[PDB]
Paper text:
The first step of nitrogen assimilation in higher plants, the energy-driven incorporation of ammonia into glutamate, is catalyzed by [name]. [name] (GS; EC 6.3.1.2) is a vital enzyme in the nitrogen metabolism of all living systems. Consistent with the diversity of metabolic roles, GS exists in plants as a number of isoenzymes, located both in the cytosol (GSII-1) and in the plastids (GSII-2), that are encoded by a small gene family. MtGSII-1a is expressed in the vascular bundles of all plant organs and is highly up­regulated in the nodules, accounting for the production of over 90% of the total nodule GS activity.
The three-dimensional structure of [name] GSII-1a was determined at 2.35 Å resolution by X-ray crystallography using synchrotron radiation. The crystallographic model revealed a decameric arrangement of the enzyme with D5 symmetry, with two stacked (face-to-face) pentameric rings. The ten MtGSII-1a monomers adopt very similar conformations, as highlighted by the r.m.s.d. of 0.35–0.65 Å for 291–311 aligned Cα atoms. The extensive contacts established between the subunits that compose each ring result in a buried inter-monomer surface of approximately 3500 Å2. The overall buried inter-ring surface amounts to ∼2500 Å2, i.e. approximately 500 Å2 per individual monomer–monomer interaction, highlighting the weakness of the inter-ring contacts. Considering the contacting monomers A and F from opposed rings, hydrophobic interactions exist between the side chain of Trp141A and both Ile147F and Gly148F, as well as between Gly148A and the side chain of Trp141F. In this particular case, the structure of the apo form of the enzyme was determined and therefore there are no ligands present in any of the ten active centres. In all of the MtGSII-1a monomers a segment comprising the Thr293–Ala299 region, homologous to the Glu-binding loop of bacterial glutamine synthetases, is disordered, leaving open the entrance to the glutamate-binding site at the narrower end of the active-site cavity. Despite the remarkable structural similarity between MtGSII-1a (r.m.s.d. of 0.98–1.03 Å for 320–322 aligned Cα atoms) and its closest structurally characterized homologue, ZmGSII-1a, there are some critical differences between the two enzymes. There is also a concerted movement of several segments of MtGSII-1a, notably the ∼180° rotation of Ala246, with its side chain now protruding into the glutamate-binding pocket, and the ∼90° rotation of the upstream Trp243 side chain that packs against Pro248 and leads to a rearrangement of the Lys237–Asp242 segment.
Author numbering:
A (entry chain G): 1 to 277, 314 to 317, 327 to 356
B (entry chain F): 1 to 277, 314 to 317, 327 to 332, 337 to 356
C (entry chain J): 1 to 276, 327 to 332, 337 to 356
D (entry chain H): 1 to 277, 328 to 332, 337 to 356
E (entry chain E): 1 to 259, 265 to 276, 329 to 331, 338 to 356
F (entry chain A): 1 to 284, 302 to 356
């Protein structure tokens, strides 16, 4: 409605100083984003000044015990592209009332790694490639799926233009701008090989914020698909039959690698990655993660292995 | 039709100083909000400066006895998020032409309680959690209700995002901004365990204003569902079959609780509520009733009642 | 389309000084409003400065004989809420080319009454309640009419809120603002007992202007229902079968009633009305109703 | 809905100095436009300052062997009419990682021709007429195709107006303004003989920028048909059966032609064109057409 | 489908002597008919030669789950107008495995009354008028219910003809013939005052068979509405709002009356023309023949 | 469409003496019925006089090996209710070209059991109850599934009548008459607890023919749902969520159990069944039995106890069981097996 969108787009700065904060977290599947919103007395840019919150963990498959309460710790702030003004998104990680990180909290361990002085001094930069597929809500097939099936790896959809080739660009372009506005370092987008299939890239992002941003980007994307009435999947294999997906390739570089200087340093890091069990060379790419893996794990494991691990 | 919203959204400040006041009241079922609007000469911020009004109680199940007139007393003003500008919402309570509160007027007795020096000195604060369900107008099942029916208490709807999980968010978000604009102390919202089910929280709100705000929040919400062509229910059990609803839990604290040695005041307060007969511990929580009644009963039982 | 509304909403002040004037009149059924629009060189606020106009009365059931021409006399100006800017609505009344009021022109005799020095001195104020029903275009039953039919006098529609109770509020709220914008003294609105049934109140309005304003308000409402694709009826009994309508009560006060003490003036006025602050009088033409009240209490001699 | 277009239409200048660049290239069929977008730190007006990029050529039928990587060289900048603000469109041509132009890269050779001192000194101007057909997505027949088939070369569609004659004008007018905004020298448009068939002209455009501009205009057009949910064809024969198409006629003038003009210089150019087989030369790649005329008339010696 | 109706209309007499018997009973609400079918070796006309059967009473609100078996006693036979041929309908009443009538079995007590020598010798005849309403499956409003709603008691529907007046006559005429074919003494039909509203009359019917026949006729009617995709209600008030229903009038005569009425009318008042038909019919006999003031 | 059904319903006896035989078999999932049809020179009543046939086993998940040919052995004849006249249905079991039964051929071992003199002398009768669900083709939810979802175990659908209660009776009544016409010993039908859920019973049928008849009855049902444009499921849980399904309960009696003294014989058989329980469950939790307590593994029934003779019910098999396995295992355990 036009009456409805007017209420949704009300600018609160004209009526008070209160802001709305959307607290966001990863649910019990490790892939389900959850959120809810609260009012704060005034604008906030420092996450550490945000109050902690809580939710019912037995409703998100995260607290089975007699105590269902789970605590939310604010960790990163972004501008809310939906509520606009001084309203914000808050990426949180999740803990028991006693202060223990939940098993589905991957940020905790990642934060320990990125806070290590020898990792922190190396200024690790990350570039993440996030593929996704837009799906018809009723049928669960990708937008533009051709009547008659699987089209193949050589087709008109990859970076295509036109009503018969690019399906869902409105969602994609809305997302690109929403992310820039929010403060995410989104570095690009492209239409992928399958109809309704797309990719966005994020980076360079330093350390723990790479994970914060990617989760923030996924949140915004699904909020946008929600508006459009379309289902989004980050699964590498979102439908049966043949399917061409990429994965979740991660580009990585340190202060030493970027100061050449250490062209050689890139190669030894690659040596270390091979030693642990895909990797190509500036910076280098890691080709093992799939499109739904947790970025906190992926990014921190690369730093640990290349900066802290000794066989 | 774009021609229509242009008219609805006209800025009257450009043409004169007159304002429109939407007078709101609780009807004969104790849960049905009613309203109508009048033009006033200029901007008003003090409810005591508003004229009294009236309506036909025989049309809202509030006047049987040969005299159908019921009187409206303005009690609280909020900004009107629908008409915008200087136009206002007016929460009223209802009286006979003779000056007596109607049986369905719960504000009067609640106000008497909050006006008592022993209550007023304790500065009672209230926090209310209002759960509600958004229902398809034609089928009366919740928005997004799954074909197989009751999904269970463990699902993707609670605080969910995405077309297949969150149903009716445009309404929820419209309501959130609308209340803040209106001047209600809405403190947050969340998607609940069932599809189409949500919650908003209001507070802390002082004394009689908790009820004023709650009714105002309910009014705004149902005005918004009206626009969206959706039905709203505040019933804990809004459909047959299995259902997970919470209720309307109420948080309460006094000045004594908020200061030094609240621990004792809190347990004692709980003891008296128990002695009268659902209560758990900052402050404490008390588990479709009228908020004027609920909030004032808590103050009275804990501050005025002497066993 | 959005291309269309852009053209409809052009601000003519940006391109010239010309304004558009919508001349409005009551047709041969006594309840059908008609209008058409003309271009004038510049802004006008004084009705007496508007040129007279004309139309084919044989197309509106208002001229049977060999000369079908009917003359329009501008009588009242309001701002046009549809064209916006300096464009205006013009309430006219209607005459033969020779200068005689048509039988369906009720403003003429009303004007004589309000022009009478004894009436004019009393500054009569009117408050008029206009009930109306919004009807589905195809079925001609009210918006929100329930499958089972007539619901009874006790229901959720009266001053109701919600998708299942208030039917047509967008029209009603558009009208309220449109009337205020136009310069009509609209004093309030409410949902009525039947679904799709509503009321607006106008006043206080002075003398002959009560009728001019009520007619302008009816005009504006029906232009709005036209936009919404809904039919409107001002008939107290707009559908067959059982139905609750209120009516059209008219509140009335003279200068004398409004001063000290007035109660006595009110007493006598009430007696004369029966025989033939303020007080209330229990599809009619507002020109007739209001002027008859003034005449009965100020000019008539029992 | 309206929420979606708000996000798409966000002005990024309010949040940072970063811009979005849409890299565009010709795919493996020689007629398929492809593109994707990346974030840059600040505004750029010089193509030579833009970073090179890459894509998977095995996905656009442009790299078969074990190395599917293809390099994009930015060549021309236009403002992005879709993202607005300081966002840009970037016309690119394509190379192997080793630095060799791909077979489907026609810009490379044209650029050698226009950079040649004997060509460059003559400032070749080009005027290109681009015909196209708007097709129903589901049926693949032109918009407004009549129940009964091919209407003939004599009809109401050529430069027509009205719902029954002009099909897809909203696309055409969006494109016209979009191209002007972008910085393309679009010189006019017209409805053509077949329903849903139209033409745009570009020029005068100097040298290599003629081809850059036509490709950018084709890109903008298909992005617009995409928004409209309509298919576009630049094929001279976009459906079976009889059909009236023009082609891609190219106008050409040299500095000397614009001087005296003399006409003799024109005669000479025409003569040389004949020998190999301003003035007019009657879906091909504009880089090829434009550069061959320049080569033949300025470099080629009989 | 013609392929489907060909299978449904197969004449089993052409392939064997086996027949199908549809056992019918009254469920736990007292108004819900239930049935299921079994194969028998050959034609049967004597209800007492039919085997008893059983069902899960916990699925029809007539037994608890821990002890759910309920026994079906065959009581009356009719020809089955749906399966045709030698196939039959069997009206049953219902008992615990120990042999007691279920509380929702009203036939048992009615049978005792009609078996009483003071009643049986008097040959009580019954005429029953059964009103019903045909309802649109999706809306639950009557067939032909007018857009503007409740029309009033004076209208064109009563005994009407035409597309705009008679709604559901196909169902009604099918029912009339089906009942006659089945062996029910259906004595007439008429369109009623409300749209989609109808009545059939059964009688004269002797004693306990009046109840058997009415239930059999109700069965046949709802099987027919099932075919037509229409819902049936025997409720006097089948929709909210105003409605014109008759009631449940019952005609009654004894052997003595047919040869008198006033003494019976007197007896009825303290407690000619006057819910479960077994109850209604037997209580009238009891009132006028067995009762003690 | 009447033009089409006229062709389908042609009486071939008026045009020739040739008949059409629909050879039917169980495919590689153990539940997928397959069939195809051939022309034979004249009418046939003796299955042993029908020629063998073959099919491509790599197309029904029944021959992975390099030789995809699988052989069809005719075993049972029924009249074809679809083609009518002298046209027939032929229940087959399936073998390698070399002559060995396929792993998915369960008839073979069952036949070996029913041919044993100790089983045959005993004349085992079987009664099988086949529950099934009719599903809307597009949504995969049952016919008549209510807008608000799962209704519960106490409702109006069980043996119900009316447009709002009984869903799919045309299919059910067509199937009942088609089976009778075909020569199958179908003994009854009823509407079940869930919307669109129904049951039919077959029996008493002696020995190996019980399985032949059950499979023929299943074939006919799915051929009828195909005509109706409806999907049929014999799965114990044809939809997610709560669901009330029974299974495929099997009644069993020997000549001795049916005569006087029979109850003592029944108890001994039940004892033997209990000693095996795990073997039977694995093929078809804690073994139990009684007369009217659910969910006993085995039920005797009031009538049997009362009379001192009759039969007993094995309530363990699920609705998608292979009747050859169930029927023959009951005979084997109670008549041939030595603990």
């Amino acid at each position: 409605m036009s009456l409805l969108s007017d209420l949704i787009n009300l600018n609160l700065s004209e009526s008070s100083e209160k802001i709305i904060a959307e607290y966001i977290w990863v649910g019990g599947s490790g892939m389900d984003l959850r959120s809810k919103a609260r009012t704060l007395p005034g604008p906030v840019s420092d996450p550490s000044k945000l109050p902690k919150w809580n939710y019912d963990g037995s409703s998100t498959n995260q607290a089975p015990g007699q105590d269902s309460e789970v605590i939310l710790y604010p960790q990163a702030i972004f501008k809310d592209p939906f509520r606009q003004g001084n309203n914000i998104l808050v990426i949180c990680d999740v803990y028991t009332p006693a202060g223990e990180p939940l098993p589905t909290n991957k940020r905790y361990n990642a934060a320990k790694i990125f806070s290590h002085p020898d990792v922190a001094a190396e200024v690790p930069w990350y570039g993440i490639e996030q593929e996704y597929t837009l799906l018809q809500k009723d049928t669960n097939w990708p937008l533009g799926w051709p009547i008659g099936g699987y089209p193949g790896p050589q087709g008109p959809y990859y970076c295509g233009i036109g009503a018969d080739k690019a399906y869902g660009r409105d969602i994609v372009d809305a997302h690109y701008k929403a992310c820039l506005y929010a403060g995410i370092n989104i570095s690009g987008i492209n239409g992928e090989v399958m109809p309704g299939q797309w990719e966005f890239q994020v980076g360079p992002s330093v350390g723990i914020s790479a994970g914060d941003e990617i989760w923030a980007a996924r949140y915004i994307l699904e909020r946008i698909t929600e508006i459009a009435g379309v289902v989004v999947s980050f699964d590498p294999k979102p439908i049966p039959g043949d399917w061409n997906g990429a994965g979740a390739h991660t580009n990585y570089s340190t202060k030493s690698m970027r100061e050449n200087g250490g062209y050689e340093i890139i190669k030894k890091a690659i040596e270390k990655l091979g030693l642990r069990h895909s990797v190509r060379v500036g910076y280098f790419e890691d080709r093992r993660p799939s499109s739904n893996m947790d970025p906190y794990v992926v990014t921190s494991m690369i730093a640990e292995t290349t900066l802290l691990w000794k066989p």
